[PDB]
């Protein structure tokens, strides 16, 4: 037989014999991930087990979307597919999906605990911006970027792990909402620069080493935002639904703090003239990302062209050919369990 089984915690991993020495590196509501050695490729890989992905609509849609996008996206700043398999030998018996991926060294939560020089900080931000733009070019807006779903290597290279939001679910896993934009928090429309809000929260956290807006729920989340940045102007208020508008206008009013006070020189390398100029430019970029009103917030391309970032600019990275997404209905599906099962199985086996 071409497979063997190993127990990983309370889970059983049944994998191809080419993959050896499995070790757990991560977990989530969607599945469980092990590092492993690929004896054929002669390199380390990551293996994600998806257990019965067709069990409900939220898991099924996410799994199907993940499979399709990994098969059609190929960019250095998005985690790359190496293999997919199932150990079950028929549609009738089909249960689990295994996705094999590039293995990276660490997540951004680990990097946030470190003091970063301007070269490394700006290069990480550049790469995030290239990954995001590439997704936007294919009509994919992430909306859920956070430190835990961004990974790095010791050479400062960076990859985004996931493709973002689509959703009730029975799960012990708690949802992190600290990086979500005001327009997502308040149920407004959104465009591409929704993702720039999240990059600003991440950047701010890299500088300060603390979560900017650590809200317990969406109501607390909003409070934390206005405390730091100030109550938005009347022009923004007028874009909200009446029921939301009454709520937002009724909160206590806050003046907010200047970006000089939010992010002072002591948080940046600021010894040499070189570092002093860079600190000033870093603060300017923050001031253009952490903007409540999306109509006044910076675009992804404006961010790529910013003085802090543009030293890295390369069109083969920042202007790559868009992904060819085959499924025109990739974000608007409703199916039965047996239908999702067959759709996913066909994708894993590569059938139509
Ligand atoms: C942490 C670091 C060592 C690392 C994680 C990782 C993954 C990885 C990919 C997906 C998952 S997951 O399917 O469990 N998704 C999680 C990510 C963390 S989260 O808080 O966003 C919940 C979903 C876990 C690890 C893939 C490749 N290299 C890696 N290096």
From Swiss-Prot:
<dbReference type="GO" id="GO:0010628">
    <property type="term" value="P:positive regulation of gene expression"/>
</dbReference>
<dbReference type="GO" id="GO:0016241">
    <property type="term" value="P:regulation of macroautophagy"/>
</dbReference>
<comment type="subunit">
    <text>Forms a complex with MAPK8IP1 and ARHGEF28. Found in a complex with SH3RF1, RAC1, MAP3K11/MLK3, MAP2K7/MKK7 and MAPK8IP1/JIP1. Found in a complex with SH3RF1, RAC2, MAP3K7/TAK1, MAP2K7/MKK7, MAPK8IP1/JIP1 and MAPK9/JNK2. Binds to at least four scaffolding proteins, MAPK8IP1/JIP-1, MAPK8IP2/JIP-2, MAPK8IP3/JIP-3/JSAP1 and SPAG9/MAPK8IP4/JIP-4. These proteins also bind other components of the JNK signaling pathway. Interacts with TP53 and WWOX. Interacts with JAMP.</text>
</comment>
<dbReference type="GO" id="GO:0097441">
    <property type="term" value="C:basal dendrite"/>
</dbReference>
<feature type="active site" description="Proton acceptor">
    <location>
        <position position="144"/>
    </location>
</feature>
<feature type="modified residue" description="Phosphothreonine; by MAP2K7">
    <location>
        <position position="171"/>
    </location>
</feature>
<keyword id="KW-0963">Cytoplasm</keyword>
<dbReference type="GO" id="GO:0120283">
    <property type="term" value="F:protein serine/threonine kinase binding"/>
</dbReference>
<feature type="modified residue" description="S-nitrosocysteine">
    <location>
        <position position="109"/>
    </location>
</feature>
<dbReference type="GO" id="GO:0043065">
    <property type="term" value="P:positive regulation of apoptotic process"/>
</dbReference>
<dbReference type="GO" id="GO:0000165">
    <property type="term" value="P:MAPK cascade"/>
</dbReference>
<dbReference type="GO" id="GO:0005634">
    <property type="term" value="C:nucleus"/>
</dbReference>
<dbReference type="GO" id="GO:0034198">
    <property type="term" value="P:cellular response to amino acid starvation"/>
</dbReference>
<dbReference type="GO" id="GO:0034614">
    <property type="term" value="P:cellular response to reactive oxygen species"/>
</dbReference>
<dbReference type="GO" id="GO:0034599">
    <property type="term" value="P:cellular response to oxidative stress"/>
</dbReference>
<dbReference type="GO" id="GO:0090398">
    <property type="term" value="P:cellular senescence"/>
</dbReference>
<dbReference type="GO" id="GO:0007258">
    <property type="term" value="P:JUN phosphorylation"/>
</dbReference>
<keyword id="KW-0418">Kinase</keyword>
<dbReference type="GO" id="GO:0006979">
    <property type="term" value="P:response to oxidative stress"/>
</dbReference>
<dbReference type="GO" id="GO:0042826">
    <property type="term" value="F:histone deacetylase binding"/>
</dbReference>
<dbReference type="GO" id="GO:0006468">
    <property type="term" value="P:protein phosphorylation"/>
</dbReference>
<dbReference type="GO" id="GO:0045202">
    <property type="term" value="C:synapse"/>
</dbReference>
<comment type="function">
    <text>Serine/threonine-protein kinase involved in various processes such as cell proliferation, differentiation, migration, transformation and programmed cell death. Extracellular stimuli such as pro-inflammatory cytokines or physical stress stimulate the stress-activated protein kinase/c-Jun N-terminal kinase (SAP/JNK) signaling pathway. In this cascade, two dual specificity kinases MAP2K4/MKK4 and MAP2K7/MKK7 phosphorylate and activate MAPK8/JNK1.</text>
</comment>
<dbReference type="GO" id="GO:0005737">
    <property type="term" value="C:cytoplasm"/>
</dbReference>
<dbReference type="GO" id="GO:0043066">
    <property type="term" value="P:negative regulation of apoptotic process"/>
</dbReference>
<feature type="binding site">
    <location>
        <begin position="25"/>
        <end position="33"/>
    </location>
    <ligand>
        <name>ATP</name>
    </ligand>
</feature>
<keyword id="KW-0770">Synapse</keyword>
<dbReference type="GO" id="GO:0071222">
    <property type="term" value="P:cellular response to lipopolysaccharide"/>
</dbReference>
<dbReference type="GO" id="GO:0032091">
    <property type="term" value="P:negative regulation of protein binding"/>
</dbReference>
<keyword id="KW-0702">S-nitrosylation</keyword>
<comment type="function">
    <text>JNK1 isoforms display different binding patterns: beta-1 preferentially binds to c-Jun, whereas alpha-1, alpha-2, and beta-2 have a similar low level of binding to both c-Jun or ATF2. However, there is no correlation between binding and phosphorylation, which is achieved at about the same efficiency by all isoforms.</text>
</comment>
<protein>
    <recommendedName>
        <fullName>Mitogen-activated protein kinase 8</fullName>
        <ecNumber>2.7.11.24</ecNumber>
    </recommendedName>
</protein>
<dbReference type="GO" id="GO:0005524">
    <property type="term" value="F:ATP binding"/>
</dbReference>
<dbReference type="GO" id="GO:0042752">
    <property type="term" value="P:regulation of circadian rhythm"/>
</dbReference>
<feature type="domain" description="Protein kinase">
    <location>
        <begin position="19"/>
        <end position="309"/>
    </location>
</feature>
<dbReference type="GO" id="GO:1903749">
    <property type="term" value="P:positive regulation of establishment of protein localization to mitochondrion"/>
</dbReference>
<dbReference type="GO" id="GO:0018107">
    <property type="term" value="P:peptidyl-threonine phosphorylation"/>
</dbReference>
<keyword id="KW-0067">ATP-binding</keyword>
<dbReference type="GO" id="GO:0009411">
    <property type="term" value="P:response to UV"/>
</dbReference>
<dbReference type="GO" id="GO:0007254">
    <property type="term" value="P:JNK cascade"/>
</dbReference>
<feature type="modified residue" description="Phosphotyrosine; by MAP2K4">
    <location>
        <position position="173"/>
    </location>
</feature>
<dbReference type="GO" id="GO:0019899">
    <property type="term" value="F:enzyme binding"/>
</dbReference>
